[PDB]
Amino acid sequence: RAARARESVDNLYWFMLAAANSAPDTPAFVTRGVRTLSYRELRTRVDDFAAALAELGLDVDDRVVLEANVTPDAVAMLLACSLLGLPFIPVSPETPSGRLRSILDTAEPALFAQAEDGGRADVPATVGTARFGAGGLRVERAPRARVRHRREIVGTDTAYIIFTPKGVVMSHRSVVSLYRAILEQGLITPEDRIATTSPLQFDFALFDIGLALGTGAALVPVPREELNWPRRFLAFLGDTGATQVHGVPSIWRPVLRHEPELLAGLDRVRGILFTGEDFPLPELRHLQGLLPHARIVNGYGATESMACSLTEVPRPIPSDLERLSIGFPLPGFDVSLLDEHGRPVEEIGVAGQIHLRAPSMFSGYWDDPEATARVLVSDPLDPRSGRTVLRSGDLAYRGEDGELYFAGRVDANRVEPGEVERRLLEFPGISAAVALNHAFVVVKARAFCADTLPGYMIPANIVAVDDIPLTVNGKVDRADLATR
Amino acid sequence: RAARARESVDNLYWFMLAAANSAPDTPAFVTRGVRTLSYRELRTRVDDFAAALAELGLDVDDRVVLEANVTPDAVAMLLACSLLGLPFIPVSPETPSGRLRSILDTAEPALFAQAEDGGRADVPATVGTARFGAGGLRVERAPRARVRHRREIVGTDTAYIIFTPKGVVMSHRSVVSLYRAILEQGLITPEDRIATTSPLQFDFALFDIGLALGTGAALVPVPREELNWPRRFLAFLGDTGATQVHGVPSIWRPVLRHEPELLAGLDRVRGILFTGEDFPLPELRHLQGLLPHARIVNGYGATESMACSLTEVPRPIPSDLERLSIGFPLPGFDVSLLDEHGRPVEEIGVAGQIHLRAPSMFSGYWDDPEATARVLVSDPLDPRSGRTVLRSGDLAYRGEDGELYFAGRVDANRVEPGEVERRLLEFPGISAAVALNHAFVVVKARAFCADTLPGYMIPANIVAVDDIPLTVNGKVDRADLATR
Ligand SMILES: N#Cc1cccc([C@@H](N)CC(=O)NS(=O)(=O)OC[C@H]2O[C@@H](n3cnc4c(N)ncnc43)[C@H](O)[C@@H]2O)c1
Ligand SMILES: N#Cc1cccc([C@@H](N)CC(=O)NS(=O)(=O)OC[C@H]2O[C@@H](n3cnc4c(N)ncnc43)[C@H](O)[C@@H]2O)c1
Fold this sequence. Notes:
The structure is a homodimer.
Chain A: H1 12-17, H2 19-22, E1 27-31, E2 35-38, H3 39-54, E3 64-67, H4 72-84, E4 88-91, H5 97-107, E5 111-115, E6 128-133, E7 136-141, E8 158-163, E9 167-171, H6 172-183, E10 193-196, H7 203-215, E11 218-221, H8 224-227, H9 230-239, E12 244-246, H10 253-258, H11 260-264, E13 271-274, H12 281-290, E14 295-300, E15 309-312, E16 334-338, E17 352-357, E18 364-365, H13 369-375, E19 376-378, E20 388-398, E21 404-409, H14 417-425, E22 432-435, E23 438-442, H15 445-450, E24 461-464, H16 478-483
Parallel strand pairs in A: 3-4, 3-5, 5-6, 10-11, 10-12, 12-13, 13-14, 23-24
Antiparallel strand pairs in A: 1-2, 6-7, 8-9, 9-18, 14-15, 16-17, 17-20, 19-20, 20-21, 22-23
Residues 203-204, 207, 275-278, 298-303, 306-307, 310, 326, 392, 394, 406, 409 of chain A line the site of one copy of the ligand N#Cc1cccc([C@@H](N)CC(=O)NS(=O)(=O)OC[C@H]2O[C@@H](n3cnc4c(N)ncnc43)[C@H](O)[C@@H]2O)c1.
PDB class: ligase
Keywords: polyketide biosynthesis, ATP binding, adenylation
Assembly: dimeric
């Protein structure tokens, strides 16, 4: 009686589990005793959860909150939801109870599912509740009864909604199109093991899952508890034989500061990928110098398209380089830089706002058509067609070869805090530095800065801190540094 | 310097010319001396026209009017436009000068191209003019100079705009998705020869071209001058060895009336496909009876998605059958029937308005965002997602097996003119009949009707005519029958 996605129709289930056929006994997951779960064993768990979910009578586009971090079970669940056309709303179990309630209030989901040993208690009787474990999907409270109206699942049905409360609605067509564009850029082979560090609620986690599983590679989820301590993190990457390490730039900060020599011992690491924010070039040069056999890729994009461009950093990074390139749009993606009148910028080195044409475009903001119409706008170079572009909120300029350079959020003398942080990171004893004019440093600095920086770039205040504070998703917490 | 579509990005060029690689010497076209043009020779002409077009400096999404009927040269041109991301506006050379001017006024194209021996004179100096022939593309007036801004072609770039002045904007992604859905329904093999009868300006022509060329089959364009006379039309189908015959129901009307015995001699015809309007069941039963080895397929859909469903008619058609089924949506398509409150109709045999979820959805109506927002509407079963559906303007009901039945335009006792026309087509001496209560017949009838029809279905007037008048696209011209 449940609709199931057909194999020919774009859908995360068929896309991520194709390797269960061509390579059933190859590893889909490596976890830590180092264990592997094969593609066949993963499809078996997905099919079991999907048989259980199908009993609940949910209609296509009924929303399932998945509270978990990246685990074989949580990935088995989101793929079960995918086959049944039930958009998942991934929520980290670290999300505060209040923030979760606010998501439940707006998203009005039919079902909330967490791990057997999950800790969430606060869930209204309108929302069904279930727990999943290699034991199976276990319904605690059934979702409330309904009449199914959707006969067939399509490409534009929602795969997932990302909540930060702003909800980015992504279709199977959009996310599969992104995975296919990256498969074309041979970032990954089937023999790779991708260490993934992002919270499940961050699309960087969904990007890592699909890149691994869509390629026939193994995923190595790094638990936050392993990530937070430098020797522990390095022993986890060594033990699991990780070949690729994905994370926001901050994942390296403790290892660079405390354990650079053990970091150099990661001889199986072939590739590093970051996204989310600028990697401070002094830390990035330090990292590159320790792992000279690891390709480093600058990943640019936003939740609204999942991603835009993948750009290998120069080897070595020029000492004098001020900004890494964010390169060229993925195959099938296109950028217009438009000025403050909405006109194309053709001039080398002049910033405009990125307007992205992407096959991975979000459907809209959940229950916010006004916000949707401000962001997903009529193509300003062809406004009579009804074609839309993403008005990204990001500034960029091109260089002489047409490559892009990120130039900050349009809404956040032009100060480049990156140049302030660079000069400070070049001062004896400073391991980290964030500017917002206040500079915060992890450990005279003022005169060292003034020896090369213009007057408007010299910090008014330089504040010693034990660490750079991070958001749940691992980005610099500038709100937090503001408070103190 | 011209952007060209990449092979990995949905685009009519790569989709229709893949057979130039796997089967270069197989026929792409059969024309009438019976000649063939191979896939390789077709790609050569496409590449030549595209090299010439690229010289003109047009930007991606610059519009090219193609005035032609279905010919190897006109198909070579629309595929050249496709590779360069130049949406084509196909216009039949039968279109009156006034109607063309009205299209030029709204669409403001950069270029108008016609055949060497084309007859159009009326084209403003703002629009470039060119003529194409196996000689090459020949520029008469260059388009006016411009700066190119688009770096890369994407999936959602416009393939073509259909004008009837209402302009349906179709993307490469939408039209390729439709061709792929039909390739999955093995309508056609590479050994087939598809006789196509629609004017190039009608998307039925574009449907036929892509089905043939995307499959590696041969296209057999039927010129209007061959189509208009019954023995001439049958000799053309015989000489070219057509294996499939596509056209609106009216293409059969003269052959059924004048040459039924020669029609039975079409021994190579394996398949017939119609769309656009109801096939009057008495003519359809007559046709099916003459070619018992031809599968007949009822094709339902609209320009806004190119198509929706393909449904093989029963063999034989039950004598008592009142309506052919329009079956089930193509793989990856989904229909909701919604009532006059906007609520799902689940009841067998109750009509509602078709809301279509389609991967082949139009981008919008050219320079008409108001009309777009009335037709491409928020999914009424999931309106907070920003997902849209086509509000089709078509009524339908389901039968016991969930199959659809077309029940007329929402805007056009409920009279079923089909039942009035049926009873008249069953009266001795009537070969055709159209009701609009007035009935028009091609050659006491009133009492024959009253012997089985309810009072409200009995024509007030029965008018003998020499023929049923047709639109350019070959549909019944009810406006025309109204005048007289
Ligand atoms: N390649 C790649 C790739 C792979 C996985 C997931 C993603 C993104 N969804 C990650 C992300 O932070 N998205 S965001 O919407 O929260 O915030 C997006 C914003 O974060 C900033 N950003 C994102 N990438 C950045 C980069 N490489 N350098 C500098 N800033 C970058 C930009 O402002 C951007 O609009 C990209
Ligand atoms: N399968 C298939 C297939 C292949 C090629 C091209 C097409 C359509 N684009 C043809 C067409 O007439 N489109 S229309 O937009 O002008 O007018 C559409 C309208 O014409 C009517 N229509 C279209 N198909 C019909 C059918 N099979 N039976 C009855 N009516 C039908 C409906 O009202 C529909 O909304 C369909």
